Amino acid sequence: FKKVAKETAITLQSYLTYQAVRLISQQLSETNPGQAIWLGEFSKRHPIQESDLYLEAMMLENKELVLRILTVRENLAEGVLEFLPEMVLSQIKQSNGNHRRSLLERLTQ
Amino acid sequence: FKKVAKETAITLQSYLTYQAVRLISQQLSETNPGQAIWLGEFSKRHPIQESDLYLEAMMLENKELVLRILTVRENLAEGVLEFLPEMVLSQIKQSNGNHRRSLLERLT
Ligand SMILES: [Zn+2]
Ligand SMILES: [Zn+2]
Ligand SMILES: [Zn+2]
Ligand SMILES: [Zn+2]
Ligand SMILES: [Zn+2]
Ligand SMILES: [Zn+2]
Ligand SMILES: [Zn+2]
Ligand SMILES: [Zn+2]
Ligand SMILES: [Zn+2]
């Protein structure tokens, strides 16, 4: 399923961008409040959903912060990605079983 | 890593459910067009982003189709999941010109 895989990987990359930004925001609130609010204001003007454009914009407005975001995103990716295939497949099987059981019990009782 | 991994796995489970519905919609458009139309109406009323509510609502409205979604999303999951870490990290390393330069300064 090449198309599905490619679209999912793009989605996953954007989502890990969002997670990296979330972590940095938390850290900034404790160590650099001025930057925490700057990032808050930037995120209101640029949708993180469009992550490539988000990062390219910040490259022009705050290069030091985007480099931190890119470093944190790669560390997150490296740490968490290989957990996902087993977690997601096991979650989906369990969720499929629960819904099939719920369905079977309606039809039968 | 733990909180992020969990939140990501949940997002991925929902995204693969969405992909399953898209695949099925395409399939219905060929072999059962009236039900592709119905599925469009269903999807405007029930956002796919609210994944559990989506499946619970369809369990009440079209049981064969919900069973089909369960089957397709699992097949997609088995077919794609193990490719993702390598694809995403490779994308992330390549797009990031600082990674290449970090390797260079390490080599010198
Ligand atoms: Zn701006
Ligand atoms: Zn661009
Ligand atoms: Zn792997
Ligand atoms: Zn694995
Ligand atoms: Zn199953
Ligand atoms: Zn409905
Ligand atoms: Zn449910
Ligand atoms: Zn039917
Ligand atoms: Zn690197």
UniProtKB/Swiss-Prot annotation, chain A:
Function: An RbcL-specific chaperone. Required for assembly of the RbcL8 core, acting downstream of the major chaperonin (GroEL-GroES). Acts on newly folded RbcL, has a transient dynamic interaction with RbcL and is eventually displaced by RbcS. The central cleft of the RbcX homodimer (RbcX2) binds the C-terminus of an RbcL monomer, stabilizing the C-terminus and probably preventing its reassociation with chaperonin GroEL-ES. At the same time the peripheral region of RbcX2 binds a second RbcL monomer, bridging the RbcL homodimers in the correct orientation.
Protein name stated in the entry: RuBisCO chaperone RbcX
Top-level taxon of origin: Bacteria
Domain remarks: The homodimer has 2 functional domains, a central cleft essential for production of soluble RbcL in which the RbcL peptide binds, and a polar surface which plays a role in correct RbcL subunit arrangement.
Alphabetical keyword list: Bacterial microcompartment, Carbon dioxide fixation, Carboxysome, Chaperone, Cytoplasm, Photosynthesis
Annotated organism of origin: Picosynechococcus sp. (strain ATCC 27264 / PCC 7002 / PR-6)
Induction: Part of the rbcL-rbcX-rbcS operon.
Subunit structure: Homodimer (RbcX2). Interacts with the exposed C-terminal peptide of RbcL ('Glu-459-Asp-468'); binds 2 RbcL peptides per RbcX2, stapling them into an RbcL2 dimer. A slightly longer peptide binds with a higher affinity, but no long-term stable interaction with RbcL is detected. Contacts a second RbcL monomer via its peripheral polar surface.
Gene designation per UniProt: rbcX
Location, primary (coarse class): other
